[PDB]
């Protein structure tokens, strides 16, 4: 049994990726952000303040014959970019890409921060990190994928994200036909609740991998590739027009730069992010200055292989084996 759900970038700068999820009976279809960097499935709902939810699709549990409120359950989450949300908890049927989890924790937001209010195209998150991170109290809720995993053909899911084009989130099988190399695996450390792994080294512009390893997390819910200041410095060292822009809070450079690739080692295999994908966006319409897809992790204190990196590959989140696979795309 499998699931396959088309995803799409929310805007022209691939800020985040959106995928439909059907909750309840009959199905209420919500566009949600699948986030392998958090552990809670939360939605804008009929309990979200109308002033916060206006313009967003919402889940209304009273119109679902399979919903049930979880007495005494509450939750609150603060995200890496300063955004937040909090609420109470229902269970209901949740179907993604045609595969259903019958009794899934669906966290209803009774408060969300301005960032989520303004992002009208999403209606919440599906947390796909480890169950240990789930924020429901007193009793944590399992993630949709953890609940689905024992009933799928295999307990794995894949992310295929693309620049400016629809991609897919698949469950229960590995569609390598979207990739041009084989899946290479490395072990995951779930001690902090994340898909944390170590890349064995990196290279800028295509020479041999160095052995300067990088510990970081595979996060479909982060836009950028966020790496330490030494790596950022190495990446931009020969990008002539590169400079830190205090207003953008990031490195920028002329849009016509021919950017070098960024490669990193998954065990002894290489994944290469082409320079194309390291140019995120012009600073505004018609601008000659562009914002880099690789930026410093020094602000958040943890390296994050976000969508900029994930776009270079078919990425296998293998919960059965607690490993992370990357096939060059």
């Amino acid at each position: 049994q499998t699931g396959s759900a088309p995803n799409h970038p929310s805007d022209s700068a691939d800020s985040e990726y959106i995928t439909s999820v059907s909750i309840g009976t009959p199905a209420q279809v919500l566009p949600l952000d699948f986030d392998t960097g958090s552990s809670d499935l939360w939605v804008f709902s009929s309990e979200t303040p109308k002033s916060s939810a206006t313009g967003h699709a919402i889940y209304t549990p009273s119109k679902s014959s399979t919903s049930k409120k979880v007495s005494g359950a509450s939750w609150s989450i603060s995200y890496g970019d300063g955004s937040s949300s909090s609420g109470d908890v229902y269970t209901d049927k949740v179907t993604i890409g045609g595969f259903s989890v019958n009794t899934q924790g669906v966290e209803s937001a009774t408060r969300v921060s301005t960032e989520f209010v303004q992002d009208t195209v999403i209606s919440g998150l599906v947390g796909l990190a480890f169950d240990s991170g789930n924020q429901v109290r007193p009793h944590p809720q399992k993630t949709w994928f953890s609940n689905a995993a024992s009933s799928l053909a295999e307990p794995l899911f894949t992310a295929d994200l693309r620049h400016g084009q629809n991609g897919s989130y698949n469950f229960g099988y590995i569609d390598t036909s979207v990739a041009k190399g084989p899946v290479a695996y490395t072990p995951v450390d779930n001690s902090q609740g994340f898909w944390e792994f170590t890349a064995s080294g990196y290279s800028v512009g295509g020479g041999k991998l160095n052995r300067n390893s990088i510990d970081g997390i595979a996060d479909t819910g982060t836009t950028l590739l966020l790496l330490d200041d030494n790596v950022v410095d190495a990446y931009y060292a020969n990008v002539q027009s590169a400079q830190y822009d205090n207003q953008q809070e990031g490195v920028v450079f002329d849009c016509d730069e021919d950017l070098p690739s960024f490669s990193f080692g998954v065990g002894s295999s290489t994944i290469t992010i082409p320079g194309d994908l390291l140019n995120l966006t012009p600073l505004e319409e018609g601008s000659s200055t562009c914002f880099g897809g690789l930026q410093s992790s020094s602000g958040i204190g943890i390296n994050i292989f976000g969508d900029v990196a994930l776009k270079a590959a078919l990425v296998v989140f293998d919960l059965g084996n607690e490993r992370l696979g990357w096939a060059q795309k």
């Binding site: 800020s15 552990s39 479909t220 982060t222």
Partner: peptide, 6 residues
Amino acid sequence: XVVXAX
């Protein structure tokens, strides 16, 4: 950017 549960 967005950065999702620090």
